[PDB]
Amino acid sequence: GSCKGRCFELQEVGPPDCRCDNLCKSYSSCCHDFDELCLKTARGWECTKDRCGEVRNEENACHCSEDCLSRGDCCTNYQVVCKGESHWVDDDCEEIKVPECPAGFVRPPLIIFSVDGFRASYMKKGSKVMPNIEKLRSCGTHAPYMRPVYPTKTFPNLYTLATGLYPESHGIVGNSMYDPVFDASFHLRGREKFNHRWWGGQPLWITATKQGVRAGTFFWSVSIPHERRILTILQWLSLPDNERPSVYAFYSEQPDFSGHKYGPFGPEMTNPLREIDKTVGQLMDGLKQLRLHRCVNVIFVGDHGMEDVTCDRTEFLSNYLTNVDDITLVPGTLGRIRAKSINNSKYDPKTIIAALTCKKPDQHFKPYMKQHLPKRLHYANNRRIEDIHLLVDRRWHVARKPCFFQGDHGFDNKVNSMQTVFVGYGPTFKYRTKVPPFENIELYNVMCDLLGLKPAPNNGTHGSLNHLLRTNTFRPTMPDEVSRPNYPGIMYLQSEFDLGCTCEEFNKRLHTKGSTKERHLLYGRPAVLYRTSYDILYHTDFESGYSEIFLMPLWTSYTISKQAEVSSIPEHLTNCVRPDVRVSPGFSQNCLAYKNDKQMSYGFLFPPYLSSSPEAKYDAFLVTNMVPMYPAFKRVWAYFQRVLVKKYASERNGVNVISGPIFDYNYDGLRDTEDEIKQYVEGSSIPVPTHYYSIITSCLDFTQPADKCDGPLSVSSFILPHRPDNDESCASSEDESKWVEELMKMHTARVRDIEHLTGLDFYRKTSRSYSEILTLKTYLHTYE
Numbered sequence: 001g002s003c004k005g006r007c008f009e010l011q012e013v014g015p016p017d018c019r020c021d022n023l024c025k026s027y028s029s030c031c032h033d034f035d036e037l038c039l040k041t042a043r044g045w046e047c048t049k050d051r052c053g054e055v056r057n058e059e060n061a062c063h064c065s066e067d068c069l070s071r072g073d074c075c076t077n078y079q080v081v082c083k084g085e086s087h088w089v090d091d092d093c094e095e096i097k098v099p100e101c102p103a104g105f106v107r108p109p110l111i112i113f114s115v116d117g118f119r120a121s122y123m124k125k126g127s128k129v130m131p132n133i134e135k136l137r138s139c140g141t142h143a144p145y146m147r148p149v150y151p152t153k154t155f156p157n158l159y160t161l162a163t164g165l166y167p168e169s170h171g172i173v174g175n176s177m178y179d180p181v182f183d184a185s186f187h188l189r190g191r192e193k194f195n196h197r198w199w200g201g202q203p204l205w206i207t208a209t210k211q212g213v214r215a216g217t218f219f220w221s222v223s224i225p226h227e228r229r230i231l232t233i234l235q236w237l238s239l240p241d242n243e244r245p246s247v248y249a250f251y252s253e254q255p256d257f258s259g260h261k262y263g264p265f266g267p268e269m270t271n272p273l274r275e276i277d278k279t280v281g282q283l284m285d286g287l288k289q290l291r292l293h294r295c296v297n298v299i300f301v302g303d304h305g306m307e308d309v310t311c312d313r314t315e316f317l318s319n320y321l322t323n324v325d326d327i328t329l330v331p332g333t334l335g336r337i338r339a340k341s342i343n344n345s346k347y348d349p350k351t352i353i354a355a356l357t358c359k360k361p362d363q364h365f366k367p368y369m370k371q372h373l374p375k376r377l378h379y380a381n382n383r384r385i386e387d388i389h390l391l392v393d394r395r396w397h398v399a400r401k402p403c404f405f406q407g408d409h410g411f412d413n414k415v416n417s418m419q420t421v422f423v424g425y426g427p428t429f430k431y432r433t434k435v436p437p438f439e440n441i442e443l444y445n446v447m448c449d450l451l452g453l454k455p456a457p458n459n460g461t462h463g464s465l466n467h468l469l470r471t472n473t474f475r476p477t478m479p480d481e482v483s484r485p486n487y488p489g490i491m492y493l494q495s496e497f498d499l500g501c502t503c504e505e506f507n508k509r510l511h512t513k514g515s516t517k518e519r520h521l522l523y524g525r526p527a528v529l530y531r532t533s534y535d536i537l538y539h540t541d542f543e544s545g546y547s548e549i550f551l552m553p554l555w556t557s558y559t560i561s562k563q564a565e566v567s568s569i570p571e572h573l574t575n576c577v578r579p580d581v582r583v584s585p586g587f588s589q590n591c592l593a594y595k596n597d598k599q600m601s602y603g604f605l606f607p608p609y610l611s612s613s614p615e616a617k618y619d620a621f622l623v624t625n626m627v628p629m630y631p632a633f634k635r636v637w638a639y640f641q642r643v644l645v646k647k648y649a650s651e652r653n654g655v656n657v658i659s660g661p662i663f664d665y666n667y668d669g670l671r672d673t674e675d676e677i678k679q680y681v682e683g684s685s686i687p688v689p690t691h692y693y694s695i696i697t698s699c700l701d702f703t704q705p706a707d708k709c710d711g712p713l714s715v716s717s718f719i720l721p722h723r724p725d726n727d728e729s730c731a732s733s734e735d736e737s738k739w740v741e742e743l744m745k746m747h748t749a750r751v752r753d754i755e756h757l758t759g760l761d762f763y764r765k766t767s768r769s770y771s772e773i774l775t776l777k778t779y780l781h782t783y784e
């Protein structure tokens, strides 16, 4: 019952007996002599010349004795001070072609060095402020920035890093949360967070253990100083082969702690950043002492950034609501609202939202029902996410009712100040290599590959980060189609239709297989990865995949050149809908349903505004090009089609557009089955989409047009909520030029998001490698 020879022991002793592990303080369960034996601090963390070849005094924090290297408990500068070696940072970058591990090591170990609140722009402070970090970044592989998950808080992002899962899937939806099934609350401070019931998914340390790879204890009690954490990892690395872990993690509270007090760009932040870099230097010096500097893979990673936030920029819910005592708020850089007491007829969340919507001219938050939040946030499918959510403007706070802190974080994850860091260094990482920015959900697959592990099912796209690594244990393969398209010719007469709406004989080559494929399907046909029956429909200006089940297109593909002219809908074609002779009356929509539904109207996927001729314009009014649209939504859609597509074509030297409907009534981010569709157009089997997407593709080399592109592609995409009002847009009374683009930028998306929501697979026939295509699919156009 003591810590004699057990300090930071990898085994965890069960109750009641006392412990000597990393987290014994966090449970208040350490042995009587834990601080005496394990938290040694005498004579600091640095050897001095007078200590060289000293006899071991066991009261010292670290050692300068000739027995220390074998134990791994030397001070990190021992060989520099006592053996005339250089610091790691003073050595030049040398390419690590293969791992160079000492005897015993069957694989390169992984060191995860996670720094709290390390904003991406701090990297610009350079080798002046952070020599060690700048060497890792220069010599190794790095991105401009890494995107965190929403909310951009500590716990959701640390656990996302460990699982590859979105917060809604792993369950840690915030630093604070209530679970109605448990009827308990989780808090950053306190003992409740230690209970396993909160934590879903499978984090890296469990994935490792289950596949026979030993993991160090990832988490450190705040009492343990940063130098003690580094020495502990160095001692663990000196263990026998059967006791030694292959994966470790260091966590730092800085620069987050100091960012909170002083804000992100204070002159006070230089000191935190120097301390962090000094600590990195101690690790890299320590690894060099053990001849592990060209063996271990190191990941320098942050959980989120930091924004300027002060007490004077606080919105109060009592300035909007008359009954803030009947509701519970998770306050701060985000809002989550809940009823105070259960069983309250007075509490209607739809009236609360209405009361919080566009009420002051300069209002610095926006309310949402969680299912109406942008889909890119993936913040809805969990019982711990409150129905009512407030997205708060950058630099602001929200509190319930009416300084020491100048910084905070937790805002929308595409906000520039919330972006964080990634650096990879070691044998498996590439040498002096810059990679495009990526999302922290992708890192778990990378870390599994660095340890030879099969990842558990997660939300990363395995293969999308292969370009970070020298050698790739995982080769992504493209999934096969589950459903082959039908290609119906002309079958029925126009006389034999009766769809209830007023509006070829000379043209034999009408709607035939010609150059439609080459003009309008630039990257091959989208593959349907679920079981359904659908038809391919060719036209002069566009191709489409028409679902016979949902009675509309799943996708519509067209290519607008830079020089394309916009035209108007003629007065005679304004209420025009033609039947499609290639599709049966049974599998077609009818106009009668849209007359019966007073709320609902219709729009077109391929725009009649962009048609190539007066002849070809008639193809846009086919019933197979038609989809259900609320009048409110048609303001947005008509503006996109008539104005914005041309604008993008003009800006990007032509664009290829792929547009279509999404059904996600259970808000899980996944394609709905027909059972889960909860709304249809009045008295018919035509389903109502929850969202509409478009994918806008062009050549990254803008000097080449979109239809003659040799090299990489550039993409931007959106998933627009299909809502009966424009209450989300506070300026929707003004001209569409003052608010529709802002709405679309808020609802930007990855092509991967649209694939989960549609069951489609895009970009199947290109000249690019599949790996490069997976990176293109995971890209988000942020507009920052």
Ligand SMILES: CC(C)CCC[C@@H](C)[C@H]1CC[C@H]2[C@@H]3[C@H](O)C=C4C[C@@H](O)CC[C@]4(C)[C@H]3CC[C@]12C
Residues within 6 Å of the ligand: 023, 026, 193, 194, 195, 196, 197, 199, 200, 201, 202, 203, 206, 219, 220, 221, 222
């Ligand atoms: C100083 C404090 C902030 C550190 C507290 C760390 C705390 C969040 C950690 C400690 C133990 C962790 C659990 C443990 O590793 C095992 C599992 C099994 C795995 O399948 C799910 C995760 C879970 C429950 C860990 C969650 C995080 C815990 C509680």
Ligand SMILES: *[C@@H]1O[C@H](CO)[C@@H](O[C@@H]2O[C@H](CO)[C@@H](O)[C@H](O)[C@H]2NC(C)=O)[C@H](O)[C@H]1NC(C)=O
Residues within 6 Å of the ligand: 165, 166, 169, 201, 378, 457, 458, 459, 668, 669, 670, 756
């Ligand atoms: C994120 O990944 C998880 C795990 O792959 C997905 O959740 C799974 O969803 C399937 C299908 O609904 C279920 O069979 C499993 O029970 C879920 N597993 C876990 C561990 O959650 C989730 O759908 C993914 N999210 C997105 C948006 O694609």
Ligand SMILES: [Ca+2]
Residues within 6 Å of the ligand: 663, 664, 665, 666, 667, 668, 669, 670, 671, 672, 676
């Ligand atoms: Ca769904």
Ligand code: NA
Residues within 6 Å of the ligand: 594, 595, 596, 597, 598, 599, 600, 601
């Ligand atoms: Na109508």
Ligand code: NA
Residues within 6 Å of the ligand: 726, 727, 728, 729, 730, 731, 732, 733
């Ligand atoms: Na409005």
Ligand SMILES: [Zn+2]
Residues within 6 Å of the ligand: 116, 117, 153, 154, 155, 256, 303, 304
């Ligand atoms: Zn944090």
Ligand SMILES: [Zn+2]
Residues within 6 Å of the ligand: 117, 154, 256, 257, 260, 409
């Ligand atoms: Zn913080």
